[PDB]
């Protein structure tokens, strides 16, 4: 298959990807892109309620806590509470949202307008001065 010379890597890989996409669309979607599911962003998925109030305890499981805070629908909240790394100026560092929202006794997280991603607000409260 190595015939055409000086074809850019972009062109070669895009050709392979569009070939796979076209064949998959023809076979298991019926040549209809509307049948393709849509998500806000695609990536970061490991191979392995409008108004909600969550409480963190000593024995609470951190992964379940972060999954609950992220929610089911894929959005900025999902990325904030499940993406392991954030992008610095050009560098990759741990997720400050996850580090801040790490569960512990006394933390109460109130998620308002969870259904609407645009208006969703997550408020974490801790015991301060009692």
């Amino acid at each position: 298959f190595t015939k055409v010379i000086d074809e850019p890597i972009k062109s070669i890989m895009d050709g392979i990807h569009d070939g796979h996409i076209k064949k998959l669309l023809h076979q298991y979607y019926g040549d209809d892109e509307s049948k393709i599911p849509a998500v806000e962003y695609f990536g970061g998925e490991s191979p392995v309620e409008d108004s909600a109030v969550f409480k963190a305890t000593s024995s609470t499981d951190e992964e379940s806590w972060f999954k609950a805070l992220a929610g089911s629908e894929i959005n900025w909240r999902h990325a904030s509470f499940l993406c392991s790394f954030i992008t610095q100026d050009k560098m990759f560092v741990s997720n400050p949202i996850r580090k801040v929202f790490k569960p512990s006794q006394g933390m109460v997280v109130e998620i308002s307008n969870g259904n609407t991603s645009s208006k969703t607000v997550v408020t974490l409260s801790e015991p301060v001065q009692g």
């Binding site: 996409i21 998959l24 849509a38 806000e40 695609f42 191979p47 992008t87 050009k90 990759f92 560092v93």
Partner: protein, 142 residues
């Protein structure tokens, strides 16, 4: 395998590897001397396809660091690439694995480490997985 799309409308082949990496399930493996070039690695990453900077053309941590810095300068913001190392030469590992750990400590976009020409033992693989703090570990069994 399935198909998925994002807000921009780009059609992705939803498959386990693609879901993990947030990119199409096609990658350019570490190739000495082909992927040695920082320009080619940066070009593939800008194209949006996984690629491994092969260490075979680098014999020193300083040289590989210069190449990685060149790749980082050439790629766009938020981009990522892997590093490929050969297991048959212990010198390669001795100068590369500490370098990968140091660059990941600095926060470099080293998405993964691929090990070719041999599968590391359980202890060595565990040490890589724990210390390097990579997104995933590639292994090329024979």
């Amino acid at each position: 395998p399935k198909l998925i799309k994002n807000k921009s409308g780009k059609i992705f082949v939803e498959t386990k590897f693609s879901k993990l990496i947030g990119r199409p399930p096609l990658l350019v493996p570490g190739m000495t001397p082909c992927t040695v070039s920082p320009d080619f690695v940066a070009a593939t990453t800008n194209a949006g396809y996984t690629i491994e900077l092969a260490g075979g053309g680098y014999f020193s941590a300083a040289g590989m660091t210069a190449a990685i810095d060149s790749v980082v300068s050439q790629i766009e913001k938020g981009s990522t690439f892997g590093i490929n190392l050969i297991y048959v030469n212990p010198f390669m590992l001795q100068w590369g694995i500490p370098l990968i750990k140091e660059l990941r400590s600095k926060g470099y976009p080293i998405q993964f480490l691929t090990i070719g020409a041999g599968v590391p033992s359980l202890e060595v693989a565990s040490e890589y997985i724990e210390t390097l703090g990579l997104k995933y570990l590639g292994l090329k069994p024979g």
